Amino acid sequence: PADQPVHNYMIKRLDRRSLNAAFSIAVEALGLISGENLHISSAMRL
């Protein structure tokens, strides 16, 4: 009398991990895209 079907209870935990990416731009560079202009002598720059 030693069979007595067994029962198991396993447990696992999460593992933390990140994933990054870089990106950059100049400050006046953005400023040019703000204005809506139809020349005004800044096309080649724009």
Next chain:
Amino acid sequence: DALLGTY
């Protein structure tokens, strides 16, 4: 470079 235009 930083050419704006020609006069």
